[PDB]
Amino acid sequence: HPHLLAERISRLSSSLEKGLYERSHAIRLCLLAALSGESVFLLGPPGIAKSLIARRLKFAFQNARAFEYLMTRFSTPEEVFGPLSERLTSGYLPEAEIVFLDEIWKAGPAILNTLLTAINERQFRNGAHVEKIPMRLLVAASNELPEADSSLEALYDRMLIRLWLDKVQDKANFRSMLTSQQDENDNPVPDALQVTDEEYERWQKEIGEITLPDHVFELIFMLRQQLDKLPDAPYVSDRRWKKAIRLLQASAFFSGRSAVAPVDLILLKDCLWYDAQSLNLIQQQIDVLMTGHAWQQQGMLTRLGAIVQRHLQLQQQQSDKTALTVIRLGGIFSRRQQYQLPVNVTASTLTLLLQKPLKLHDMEVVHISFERSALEQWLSKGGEIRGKLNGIGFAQKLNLEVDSAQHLVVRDVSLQGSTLALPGSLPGEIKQQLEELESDWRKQHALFSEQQKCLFIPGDWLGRIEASLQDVGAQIRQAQQ
Amino acid sequence: TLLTAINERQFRNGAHVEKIPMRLLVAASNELPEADSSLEALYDRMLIRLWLDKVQDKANFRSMLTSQQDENDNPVPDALQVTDEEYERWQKEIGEITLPDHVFELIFMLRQQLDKLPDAPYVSDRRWKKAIRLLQASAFFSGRSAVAPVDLILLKDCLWYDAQSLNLIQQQIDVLMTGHAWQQQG
Amino acid sequence: QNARAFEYLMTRFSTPEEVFGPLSERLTSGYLPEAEIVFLDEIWKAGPAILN
Ligand SMILES: Nc1ncnc2c1ncn2[C@@H]1O[C@H](COP(=O)(O)OP(=O)(O)O)[C@@H](O)[C@H]1O
């Protein structure tokens, strides 16, 4: 039964897209928020299809009403909620479902005061006795941004989705859009894809029953502590974290899932920023989190380093068997030039082992890696060499010289010698621990290859997730060679 | 109330709503609205922006100064007046006009040219969609079945918004019509 | 057992007639003179007559 729900939603959003190209992210987000009792906000220049989406989502139901009003600087509350006689609310907002409010950043003082009580309580102060408001979707569009110290920020902090629409840019999607024969006032939604009033009241209760996995909570709490340490990061209130869960739980509900999926965190890119300055900061932190700690991308990186450290620890103990012989070629030159091994080594960032460890830069080291593009220059022209320690940090300078027996003596602050050596051409203990970590990559990749059919996920985000999973898998297959 | 009578051709009336048989919406004024006001919502929705001015020619002013033609009679004959049935049928055949591939190369090029110029006015996506209905209607009443490249001349009064951008829109189209239209500069 | 709520937001252009109730003598049906627990957010921007 839950698997058949994702098919009906995919056919409902397909009929709503017919007529508005390059607006999939602006229509799918409004349909999910309407079925879960959430709001949505739009921003952009007037004329990028902002009022039609408010009149298009009403055809997906069976008892919805439209209300397209423009808030002016001299607007009165009696002209919005209907004039009083006790208030004639015949087709306005208290009895409507999907209302539209354009230029909301300039209404009267009493207009904004009545809108705050109709969101947290879904009621209205209609004279003496109050009544409920069957509001299913709240949308608002404008153009500019409010002040930093004003009363208009009370409503902006309560809206969940902050859509960022813009004009068309693609040429192929503009051909049929320029000459579109589809009417904007008909009923393109079939009668079989429209939900009833009974199914809406039942879905409002099953969303809260979605369980929260322990691995999902590790990503939400980490993002909150990350934005608090950055001064340029925008502040996120506690209400935004609670209202965002209802959106993620509703995305997995209409997609054939019973728990919160880690891929649902992509929708948080339009629920944290507030201006154009913080727009590039929210999309940057989530892109790193979705390609770092989502499917355990960086989690396997800190575990693979312990396997390499354990493998290199057993190779430096038996380094006396295979040393490092440098070829001789001192012909006619002012300095005894050297050269590395030919076909034996071909890597660029190869590592070199040492016998007796030394204390370089007030720390211990067990392996030093050099660059192939930088080793040929020092062994031919001379000068100084720069190499990092333990494969981390920057390429610090070392006191490396040539040996009489064709070796590499590393000098420190105590004038101590250390002959370098290269690792030869896998122990059973390292192979056993490596297969356990490699099997974890296939388990995390199998989860992404099953839930990628979510309709509420953009298409440009799948290119960065797949490129992040292949980068980790390409590094774990190099040490096993 | 004027915004709901354009996109939906309806008007609220207490309880039930009704349609408006509005065929032509004309508006005239003198000054320009503010840059940050609610009056810009109606200006961005109007298609044709006619720029009328006083007479300048001397030959056309002689008969105009002493004109005996009445302005309250019926100079239109009864044989040239269309009926209510022909109006409802013409509203459907306008959308059936095909869009040639050579015409699309000029509309998309004009949109990208105004975006690179900082002094050029901004044109929303609604204006590009509503302008096609005007060009397709010009070729419909002229004996054509497709969008004619010469119909782009009427775009000189559907892009500008003030007196500053009036000389910029009429200059870019004049070069486009005498450059990339019939492959002049091409 | 007989309390009433009143969530109001004070603005820089608020009027006293929109808080206590518009006059006809003042229609104070469910506001502040007959309420018990009222809420006032952003009180540091109200008008001079509201604070008085
Ligand atoms: N980007 C777009 N793609 C397709 N159609 C559009 C687009 N922008 C506007 N339209 C069309 O213009 C008409 C009017 O849009 P409108 O409500 O004025 O947009 P806005 O509310 O952003 O000003 C709509 O019926 C819509 O079909």
Please give the structure tokens belonging to residue A303: 């575990």
Query: How far apart are alpha carbons A455 and A259 in whole angstroms?
Result: 17
Tokens of A246: 């209802």
Q: What CA–CA distance (Å, rounded) separates A102 from A51? A: 8
Tokens coding A143: 């153009």
Asked if residues A66 and A187 have their Cβ atoms less than 8 Å apart, the reply is no
Query: Where does chain B have alpha helices with state H?
Result: 4-7, 40-43, 59-65, 84-93, 101-116, 125-140, 166-176
Interface of A with C (CB under 8 A): 109-110, 112-113, 116-117, 125, 127-128, 150-151, 154
**Nearest residue to A460 via CA among A182, A269, A322, A240:** A269
Phi and psi, residue A421, nearest 5°: -150, 155
Q: How far apart are CA A445 and CA A440, in angstroms?
A: 9
Angle subtended at Cα A130 by Cα A124 and Cα A135, rounded to the nearest 5 degrees: 40
Identity of the amino acid at A464: R
Tell me the one-letter amino acid at A417.
G
DSSP collapsed to 3 states, A204-244? HHHCCCCECCHHHHHHHHHHHHHHHHCCCCCCCCHHHHHHH
Best residue of A111, A178, A180 to probe chain B, by most B CBs closer than 10 Å: A178
**Residues of A with CB below 8 A from B122's CB?**
45
Closest Cα of chain A to B47: distance in Å?
A: 13
- Tokens representing A282 are 């929210």
Distance CA B68, CA A102 (A): 50
- In angstroms, the CA A378 to CA A371 distance is 11
Strands of the sheet with A137-141, listed across from one edge: A68-70, A98-102, A137-141, A39-41, A161-162
Rg (CA), chain B: 20
- By CB neighbour count within 10 A (0-12 exposed, 13-18 middle, 19+ buried), where does B185 fall? exposed
> Please, what sign has the CA dihedral across residues A390, A391, A395, A399?
positive
Q: Do C18 and A150 touch (CB under 8 A)?
A: no
Q: Any residues with CB less than 8 A from the CB of C33 and at least 6 apart, and which? A: C20, C21, C26
Q: Which region holds residue B73: left if phi is over 0, alpha if psi is between -120 and 50, else beta?
A: beta
d(CA A372, CA A369): 10
Count CB atoms within 10 A of the CB of residue B16.
8
Q: Which residue of A has its CA nearest to C18?
A: A110
Burial class (CB in 10 A: 0-12, 13-18, 19+), A299: middle
CB B139 within 8 A of CB B151: yes
Report whether B180 contacts B186 (CB < 8 A): yes
Q: How far is the CA of A49 from the centre of ligand 1 (A)?
A: 3
Q: Which of B7, B42, B45, B126 has the most ligand 1 atoms within 8 A of CB, as the residue to mutate?
A: B126
Q: How many A from CA of B50 to the centre of ligand 1? A: 23
Please give the structure tokens belonging to residue B30.
């003198």
Q: Distance of CA C49 to CAs A107, A109, A139, C17, C46, Å?
A: 22, 16, 35, 10, 8
Q: What CA–CA distance (Å, rounded) separates A23 from A388?
A: 50
How far apart CA A25 and CA A457 sit, in angstroms, is 8
**Is residue A130 classed exposed, middle or buried when 0-12, 13-18 and 19+ CB atoms within 10 A define those classes?**
middle
How far, in Å, is the centroid of ligand 1 from the Cα of A171?
17
User: CA A243, CA A235: separation in Å to the nearest integer?
Assistant: 15
Going from the Cα of B127 to the center of ligand 1, the distance in angstroms, rounded, reads 9
- How distant, in Å, are the alpha carbons of A118, A256, B42 from that of A61? 21, 21, 30
Residue A357 and residue A360: Cα distance in Å, rounded?
Answer: 9
Strand partners, A84: A87
Give residue A47's region: left, alpha or beta (phi > 0; psi -120 to 50): left
Q: Is residue B74 exposed (0-12), middle (13-18) or buried (19+ Cβ within 10 Å)? A: exposed
List the one residue out of A134, A75, A148, A63 whose CA is nearest residue A106: A75
Beta strands A386-389 and A359-360, pairing class: unpaired
Q: How far is CA B101 from the centre of its chain?
A: 23
Identify the burial level of A398 via C-beta atoms within 10 angstroms of its C-beta, where 0-12 means exposed, 13-18 middle and 19 or more buried.
Answer: buried
Q: What secondary structure does DSSP assign to B11-30, as a single string?
A: E--SSS-EE----------S
Distance to chain B for A301, nearest Cα, Å? 45
Q: In whole angstroms, what is the distance from residue C18 CA to residue A78 CA?
A: 13
Q: Is C26 in a helix, a strand, or coil?
A: strand
Which residues in C lie closer than 8 A to residue A151 (C-beta atoms)? Answer: 9-12, 42, 45
User: How far apart are alpha carbons A213 and A219 in whole angstroms?
Assistant: 11
Q: How far apart are CA C24 and CA B94, in angstroms?
A: 57
Residue A258 CA to residue A247 CA, distance in Å, equals: 14
Interface probe, candidates B36, B45, B125, chain A, greatest A C-beta count within 10 A: B125
Q: Which residues of A337-368 are buried (b: 16+ CB within 10 A; e: fewer)?
A: bbebeeeeeeeeebbbbbeeebebeeeebebb
A128 vs C contacts (CB less than 8 Å): 29-30
Sign, CA torsion A310/A313/A317/A322:
positive
Nearest to A110 among C18, C30, C42 (CB): C18
Rounded CA-CA distance C4/C33 in Å is 11
How far is the C-alpha of A344 from the C-alpha of A124, rounded, in Å? Answer: 81
Residue A407 in contact with residue A324, Cβ under 8 Å?
Answer: yes
- CB contact under 8 Å between A151 and C11, yes or no, is yes
Structure tokens at B112: 């990208």
- Find out whether C8 and A120 touch, Cβ atoms under 8 Å: no
Are C11 and A125 inside 8 Å of each other by CB? no
Counting every residue written for chain B, the total comes to 186
| The amino acid at A40 | V
Instruction: Provide the b/e sequence for A1-39 (b: ≥16 CB within 10 Å).
Output: eeeeebeebeebbebbbebbbbbbbbbbbbbbbbbbbbb
- CA B17 to chain CA centroid, Å, is 29
Nearest CA to ligand 1 atom 23: A47
Residue minimizing CA distance to atom 26 of ligand 1:
A49
Q: Which residues in chain C touch residue A113, judged by CB atoms under 8 angstroms apart?
A: 8-9, 11, 18
Distance from the A11 Cα atom to the nearest Cα atom in chain B, whole angstroms: 27
d(CA A107, CA A74): 7
Reading the block at residue A14, the tokens are 């397909």
Copy the structure tokens of residue A117.
């009580």
Q: Note whether A57 and A100 are within 8 A (CB).
A: no
Listed residue (B115, B41, B46) closest to A143, CA to CA: B41
Crossing angle (nearest 10°) for helices B166-176 and B101-116: 140
CA-closest residue to ligand 1 atom 6: A49
DSSP for A101-155, written as a single string: EESGGG--HHHHHHHHHHHHS-EE--SSS-EE----EEEEE-SS---SSSTTHHH
Cα A334 from chain centre: 57
Chain C interface residues (partner A, CB cutoff 8 A): 7-15, 18, 29-30, 41-42, 45
Contact yes or no for A40/A165 (Cβ under 8 A) = no
Q: Which residues in A10-54 belong to E strands, given as ranges?
A: 39-41
Of B41, B95, B107, the CB nearest to A178: B107
A174 CA distance to ligand 1 middle (Å): 13
In angstroms, rounded to a whole number, what is the distance separating the alpha carbons of residues A282 and A223?
10
Q: Find the length of chain A.
A: 481
Q: Residue A59, Cβ neighbours under 10 Å: how many? A: 19
Cite the DSSP H helix spans in A365-415.
372-378
Task: List the residue whose alpha carbon is closest to atom 1 of ligand 1.
Answer: A48
How does strand A363-364 pair with strand A420-421? unpaired
| CA dist., res. B139 & res. B148, Å (int) | 7
Q: The tokens of A54 are what? A: 């408010």
Beta carbons within 10 angstroms of residue A318's beta carbon: 10
- Tokens read off for B51: 């720029």
Ligand 1: residue of A18, A41, A48 to mutate (most ligand atoms within 8 A of CB) is: A48
Q: What six digits make up the tokens of A238?
A: 């506690």
How far, in Å, are A301, B11, B109 from residue B116 at the CA level?
45, 41, 11
User: If you measure from the C-alpha of residue B22 to the centroid of ligand 1, how many angstroms do you get, rounded to a whole number?
Assistant: 21
Compute φ and ψ for A395, nearest 5 degrees: -75, 85
What span, in angstroms and rounded, lies between the C-alpha atoms of A79 and B163? 35
- Token pair 């006059």 is at which residue? C23
Q: Which two tokens stand for residue B161?
A: 């918004």
- Cα–Cα dist A290/A460, whole Å: 13
Q: Which residues pair with A411 in a beta bridge?
A: A399
Tokens in use for A154? Answer: 């009370």
Chains B and C touch (3+ CB pairs under 8 A): no
- Give the pairing of strands A327-328 and A338-339: antiparallel
Helices (H) and strands (E) in chain A, counts: 14, 18
The sign of the CA dihedral B177, B183, B184, B186 is: positive
Determined by cryo-EM
- Contact between A46 and B124 using a beta-carbon 8 Å cutoff: yes
Residue with tokens 């104070």: C28
Residues in a beta bridge with A392: A389
Q: Following CA atoms A353, A359, A361, A367 in sequence, which dihedral angle do they give, to the nearest 10 degrees?
A: 10
Integer Cα distance of A427 and B85 in angstroms: 91
Closest chain B residue to A72, measured at CA: B38
Q: How far apart are CA A165 and CA B26, in angstroms?
A: 31
Instruction: State the burial class of residue A294 (Cβ atoms within 10 Å of its Cβ: 0-12, 13-18, 19+).
Output: buried
Tell me the C-alpha distance between A368 and B148, whole Å: 73
| Dihedral angle over CA of C14, A239, A70, B40, nearest 10 | 100
Name the token pair of A163. Answer: 């859509």
- Protein residues with CB under 6 Å of any ligand 1 atom: A 19-21, 46-52, 168, 177, 184; B 125-126, 129
**Ligand 1 atom at minimal distance to the Cα of residue B124:** 8
Determine the angle formed by the axes of helices A462-476 and A297-315, rounding to 10 degrees: 10
C11 and A128: CB-CB below 8 Å?
Answer: no
Strand (E) or helix (H) holding A386: strand A386-389
**C-alpha dist (Å) from residue B153 to A21, A324, A345, B134, B172:** 28, 81, 71, 11, 11
Chains touching chain A through at least 3 C-beta pairs below 8 angstroms are: B, C
CA distance A110 to chain C (A): 7
For A421-476, give the DSSP string: E------HHHHHHHHHHHHHHHHHHHHHTTSTT-TTS-STTHHHHHHHHHHHHHHH
What's the number of CA atoms in the CB half-sphere (13 Å) around residue A15?
Answer: 19
Nearest to A47 among B7, B15, B124 (CB): B124
- Atom 9 (ligand 1) nearest CA: A49
Chain A: nearest CA to B132, how far in angstroms?
7
Quote the crossing angle between the two packed helices A279-290 and A462-476, to the nearest 10°. 40
B107: closest CA of chain A, how far (Å): 9
Q: The tokens of A475 are what? A: 């590094």
What H or E segment, with its residue span, contains residue A34?
Answer: helix A24-36
